[PDB]
Design a protein around this ligand. Structure first.
Ligand SMILES: Cc1cc2nc3c(=O)[nH]c(=O)nc-3n(C[C@H](O)[C@H](O)[C@H](O)COP(=O)(O)O)c2cc1C
Ligand code: SF4
Ligand code: SF4
Ligand code: SF4
Ligand code: SF4
Ligand code: SF4
Ligand code: FES
Ligand code: FES
Lengths: 230, 108, 427, 28, 54, 117, 207
């Protein structure tokens, strides 16, 4: 009664008519690597770090946005997929300058816990690396835009939830920045909450700015009372 | 794959399937599980009852010698609900092999 | 294919060029029988083109006959439109804008007669604004007829007639895809969508649209006016019709001509009119597609007929319908870089393979040409090109590598010796 | 040929003769 | 060194220019390798007798 | 390749080559090292407290080999042995001198040894 | 070029001629209602026309007309090409340089301008009226290294007569935006003749 069976890696699983690959292949316990996809936001296609390899068809699809039809064999781990996820994450390390000693996300970043486990080994480039320039927003968000893997996860969020529509995409070709065309500072509530979003260290917090790396701390859960919702 | 990856060897993995097949055959009062470590070693999961008994069968026979006791040890695991573990480890001088014998327990 | 031609008579699918530019009764050819066509059931037109089965001029396969009798069979709540590229993206195409320049009276019919098949509502066209003068005149051509009462809202004789709303772009490639054009018809920035939403006939302006091309909707009325049994004339049992080629880059008088399929390139290039460079001993290094196909050397190309699937027999086919060649002085390695230096400027830039993946080549291509650090690179640079295929959304990536993919094929040494030419030089 | 002056082109015959539009809403 | 570089650090010429040579030198000096589960044993001949590791 | 008393170099006109990237701290088996950064006035980061305990240090050669900016370096002088354990704990500004007392020793070893690793 | 504005004309000010508010009635008339919300492509460009290059207060103005937050404009003007954000000259000229246009040696119709016109590429003439660029994919490659001026194009050119096309323009004379030499329409020549005919006595597929 309204569900499909589809074999993920040779194992049957039920899925409502209209869940994507990624929401199926999560049900059996795998992460297709993720960059532009995020639950609470919307979805677009511009990372290209999830390429699942469908069974018996020469093209390679993308497991973010595309439905799942009567059962494919959704083949995560083969010699075809592993030919892509290694071939994208050597691209987005083309320009990503040689920070990590001092990029304040240097203990969680996702150009780090992907690109050891999944993807490449060493580099062949050998010369290059645009460096654009930063600006400022407010006395919270600190902005070095030299990095920006350009998921566009900070942008779909402004026009989304916190309704302030400002941030934009300015340019064409190898060069497009993100931050605002004019000089407008961007300030509101919940918009100090961006710096969970951005998967690499473009947007990092001001007061905390340089104090400690995040392997040393101690997570002791708590509750915030200044106000109603807690 | 060859250059940096450890080359495997099959023969060692065929026999230690057999010779361990049937020590679940001739002492089923005791042995509750057996398997083959991908590196060609065996692990015999044995109830705590047979300890003196099973070894004694492993102590002498013409098909399994296992005279040399090398390493007794332990591991202690919470959330196993029977805490500790033993692992006996025995070398059979004639037949060139290692077969380890795991037996659980508690404190009391 | 018959006699290995592809001839040109005064019997062709295009009426006139130097005769009458302005309006009128369509003195002879056009606007002839209408009320009889439209008054018969619409699906009579559908599949009646199958007698021809036009592959389409949009630079691809997928015969135009299917997609219109394809979905957009039903209708429910929301109107359907027509978006017909007038744009040219490919360098040296030039086929377009000659249709519009001296004879606009054809296509406004081409939609009206065409749009009835879609069951559509309105008519949009689109034109690169970079043509200011010629594109400006269509409105007159619209008015000079439409004002007479030839179109809309019943015109003529049916209860169904609707007008055509011109628009314009600026720095577009956008015709580089459908599902981009229908986005920048709207006024967003133009980043083409993902291809399978709901492919291009579900997700649309507000509501299903179909993206046609120029001579796909231009030649439809005259092929539904007569058709046949002459609809299939030249070309084998697969591809059939007579399209336009526009020769460029070495010839006596590079100019358009109507030529049917299966024409060999050795008589066609030489003809219309001369071969003015060396018809041979000029080495004839040729490009079948405009930008979408790599080189062919002096080999079977010259006997290879221009039929589509005949070209897939070679390492690359071409749907673009254009020709650029070379003789002697033009250094190919020098002359292919400014085909790549072009790609880097026309790309959207969403996807990680396209952006940041084309420059990796374009930054190195100025090593080879200049002549510079050692081989074994060539072996890599091939893999890069092999590494962008299923990885990009639009075809611009799949149309990004082929020139370089097919340069490493067909010419080995010209590079190998030049890296020496600077190697010995360094010494 | 007329560098400026898209006017009557856009606003003369087009303005009166582009019916209705209904175009609906989309309030939103 | 072993070549594959997930288990070996790179040189000081390589970690100091290209990109991939931090993220495998800067995650290799905080957490370690990732070495699959499962038990071993081994032995050698040390000058006075055997030596184990279990 | 000998190991011994510690130092902190500086380039030509001096930058205190250490950037406080908190590594030579995190590979240390014995856990001698102790580092506290905090942004220096211009905005380039440097240290404040840097303390190698000289009793705990087990002389690995793990803190010579993790520093990417190539600061901290085990000297080749066995000058040691003072009479009070209140002492051997080092601060920052004991080290630098102890590493500017000879840089004619150090700066000429690495350029023998750095071609191997 | 850079895509940030150093607060040039935040209030320039700027406004549309009251002759233009009667056309914007017609443009929006095109689209359906409630989605209207972007006519921006003509409307933002019409504003370029009234002025000749649009300052930042032009980008802010249309937002007050179109009620879209004016980062949904500054974006669209930085994507396309035709719009000129910075100031320009009286004639903004193009030299098509691409594979076909290279094969016929567009460099011919390019430099020998520096020896004539006496300015570099990408630089406006010291006064106003001239600047120089090059672009790709416009019009025809069937012609010679064709050239664009502003609203027109000169097909089938050569270094000899383009000396005139600039120099007669410096005088204020406008020399016929067409392929001045060879064939006027870019004709096949080789089957141009054809003897046009009515469509073969219709009544064909009447069935
Ligand atoms: C770089 C590029 C440029 C293109 N330029 C055009 C163009 O100028 N005109 C056009 O009709 N299609 C162009 N296309 C392809 C569009 O996909 C095509 O117009 C659309 O698929 C409509 O096809 P159809 O109407 O023949 O079915 C271009 C594609 C690319 C990648
Ligand atoms: S920012 Fe992300 S990527 Fe750039 S260095 Fe620090 S970690 Fe490595
Ligand atoms: S912040 Fe860094 S990551 Fe987040 S969007 Fe802007 S650039 Fe892309
Ligand atoms: S290639 Fe990637 S970036 Fe370039 S246009 Fe097509 S999608 Fe946008
Ligand atoms: S030397 Fe290397 S490790 Fe010791 S502090 Fe300076 S940077 Fe961090
Ligand atoms: S010297 Fe040996 S012990 Fe002292 S810090 Fe460096 S590594 Fe840890
Ligand atoms: S994660 Fe695949 S689209 Fe962003
Ligand atoms: S591309 Fe240069 S003129 Fe068409």
């Amino acid at each position: 009664s309204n569900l499909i069976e589809v074999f993920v890696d040779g194992q049957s699983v039920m899925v409502e008519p209209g869940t994507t690959v990624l929401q199926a292949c999560e049900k059996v316990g795998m992460q297709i690597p993720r960059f532009c996809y995020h639950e609470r936001l919307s979805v677009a296609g511009n990372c290209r770090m999830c390429l699942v390899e469908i069974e018996k068809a020469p093209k390679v699809v993308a497991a973010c946005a595309m439905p799942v039809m009567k059962g494919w064999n959704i083949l995560t781990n083969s010699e075809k997929t592993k030919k892509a996820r290694e071939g994208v994450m050597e691209f987005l390390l083309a320009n990503h300058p040689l920070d990590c000693p001092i990029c304040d996300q240097g203990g969680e970043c996702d150009l780090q816990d992907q690109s050891m486990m999944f993807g490449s080994d060493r580099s062949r480039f050998l010369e290059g690396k645009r460096a654009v320039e930063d600006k400022n927003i407010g006395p919270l968000v600190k902005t070095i835009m030299t990095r920006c893997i350009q998921c566009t996860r900070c942008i779909r969020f402004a026009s989304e939830i916190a309704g302030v529509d400002d941030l934009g995409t300015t340019g064409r070709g190898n060069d497009m920045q993100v931050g605002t065309y004019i000089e407008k500072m961007f300030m509101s509530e919940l918009s100090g909450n961006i710096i969970d979003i951005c998967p690499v260290g473009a947007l990092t917090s001001k007061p905390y700015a340089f104090t400690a790396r995040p392997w040393e701390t101690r997570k002791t859960e708590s509750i915030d009372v200044m106000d109603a919702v807690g | 794959t060859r250059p940096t990856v450890r080359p495997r060897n099959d023969v060692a993995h065929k026999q230690l399937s057999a010779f361990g097949e049937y020590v679940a055959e001739i002492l089923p009062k005791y042995v509750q599980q057996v398997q083959v470590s991908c590196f060609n070693e065996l692990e015999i999961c044995i109830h705590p009852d047979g300890v003196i008994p099973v070894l004694t069968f492993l102590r002498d026979h013409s098909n399994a010698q296992f005279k040399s006791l090398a390493d007794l040890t332990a591991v202690d695991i919470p959330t196993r609900q029977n805490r500790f573990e033993i692992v006996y480890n025995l070398l059979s001088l004639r037949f060139n092999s290692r077969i380890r014998v795991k037996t659980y327990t508690d404190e009391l | 294919f018959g006699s290995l031609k592809d001839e040109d008579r005064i019997f062709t699918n295009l009426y006139g060029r130097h005769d009458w530019r302005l309006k009128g009764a369509q003195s002879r050819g056009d606007w002839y029988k209408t009320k009889e066509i439209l008054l018969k059931g619409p699906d009579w037109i559908l599949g009646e083109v199958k007698t021809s089965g036009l592959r389409g001029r949009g630079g691809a396969g997928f015969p135009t006959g299917l997609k219109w009798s394809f979905m957009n069979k039903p209708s429910d709540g929301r109107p359907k439109y027509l978006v017909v590229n007038a744009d040219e993206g490919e360098p040296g195409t030039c086929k377009d804008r000659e249709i519009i320049r001296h004879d606009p009276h054809k296509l406004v019919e081409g939609c009206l007669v065409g749009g009835r098949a879609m069951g559509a509502r309105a008519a949009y066209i689109y034109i690169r604004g970079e043509f200011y003068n010629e594109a400006s005149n269509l409105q007159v051509a619209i008015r000079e007829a439409y004002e007479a009462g030839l179109i809309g809202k019943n015109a003529c004789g049916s209860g169904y007639d609707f007008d055509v709303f011109v628009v314009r772009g600026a720095g577009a490639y956008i015709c580089g895809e459908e599902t981009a054009l229908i986005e920048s018809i709207e006024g967003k920035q133009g980043k083409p969508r993902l291809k399978p939403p709901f492919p291009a006939d579900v997700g649309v302006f507000g509501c299903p649209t179909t993206v046609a091309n120029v001579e796909t909707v231009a030649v439809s009325p005259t092929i539904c006016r007569r058709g046949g049994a002459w609809f299939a004339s030249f070309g084998r049992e697969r591809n059939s019709g007579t399209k336009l080629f526009n020769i460029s880059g070495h010839v006596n008088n590079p100019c358009t001509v109507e030529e049917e399929m299966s024409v060999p390139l050795k008589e066609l290039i030489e003809k219309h009119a001369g071969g003015v460079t060396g018809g041979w001993d000029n080495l004839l290094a040729v490009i079948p597609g405009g930008s979408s196909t790599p080189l062919i050397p002096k080999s079977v190309c010259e006997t290879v007929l221009m039929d589509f699937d005949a070209l897939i027999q070679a390492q690359t086919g071409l749907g673009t319908a254009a020709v650029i060649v070379m003789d002697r002085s033009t250094d190919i390695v020098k002359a292919i870089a400014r085909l790549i230096e072009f790609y880097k400027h026309e790309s959207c830039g969403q996807c990680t393979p396209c952006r940041e993946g084309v420059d990796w080549m374009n930054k190195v291509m100025a090593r080879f040409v200049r002549g510079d650090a050692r081989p074994a690179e060539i072996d890599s640079l091939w893999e890069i090109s092999k590494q962008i295929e299923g990885h990009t959304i639009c075809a611009l990536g799949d149309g990004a590598a082929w020139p370089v993919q097919g340069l490493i094929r067909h010419f080995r040494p010209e590079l190998e010796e030049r890296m020496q030419q600077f190697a010995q030089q360094h010494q | 040929y007329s560098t400026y002056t898209f006017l009557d082109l856009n606003l003369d015959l087009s303005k009166f003769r582009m019916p209705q539009p209904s175009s609906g809403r989309e309030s939103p | 060194k072993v070549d594959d570089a997930k288990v070996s650090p790179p040189k000081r010429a390589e970690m100091k220019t290209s990109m991939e040579s931090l993220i495998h030198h800067f995650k290799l000096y905080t957490e370690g390798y990732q070495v699959p589960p499962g038990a071993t044993y081994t032995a050698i001949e040390a000058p006075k007798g055997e030596f184990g590791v279990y | 390749r000998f190991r011994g008393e510690h130092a902190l170099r500086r380039y030509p006109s001096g930058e205190e080559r250490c950037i406080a990237c908190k590594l030579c701290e995190a590979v240390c088996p014995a856990q001698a090292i102790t580092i506290e950064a905090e942004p220096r006035a211009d905005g380039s980061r440097r240290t404040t407290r840097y303390d190698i305990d000289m009793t705990k240090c087990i002389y690995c050669g793990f803190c010579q080999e993790a520093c990417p900016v190539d600061a901290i370096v085990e000297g080749p002088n066995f000058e040691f042995s003072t009479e009070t354990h209140e002492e051997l704990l080092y601060n920052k500004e004991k080290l630098l001198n102890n590493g500017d007392k000879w840089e004619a020793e150090i700066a000429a070893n690495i350029q023998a040894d750095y071609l191997y690793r | 070029v850079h895509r940030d504005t150093p607060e040039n004309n935040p209030e320039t000010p700027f406004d549309f001629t009251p002759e233009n508010y009667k056309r914007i009635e017609a443009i929006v008339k095109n689209y359906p209602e409630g989605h209207k919300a972007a006519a921006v492509l003509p409307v933002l460009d019409l504003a370029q026309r009234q002025n000749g290059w649009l300052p930042i207060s032009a980008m802010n103005k249309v937002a007050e007309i179109l009620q879209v937050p004016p980062m949904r404009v500054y974006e669209v003007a930085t994507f396309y090409t035709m719009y000129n954000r910075k100031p320009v000259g009286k004639y903004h000229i193009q030299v098509c340089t691409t594979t076909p246009c290279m094969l016929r040696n567009s460099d011919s119709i390019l430099e020998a301008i520096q020896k004539k016109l006496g300015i570099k590429v990408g630089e406006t003439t010291p006064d106003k009226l001239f600047t120089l660029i090059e672009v790709e994919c416009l019009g025809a490659c069937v012609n010679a290294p064709m050239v664009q001026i502003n609203d027109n194009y000169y097909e089938d050119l050569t270094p000899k007569d383009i000396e005139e096309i600039i120099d007669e323009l410096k005088a204020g004379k406008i020399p016929k935006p067409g392929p001045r030499s060879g064939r006027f329409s870019c004709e096949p020549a080789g089957g141009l003749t054809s003897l046009t005919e009515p469509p073969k006595g219709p009544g064909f597929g009447v069935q």
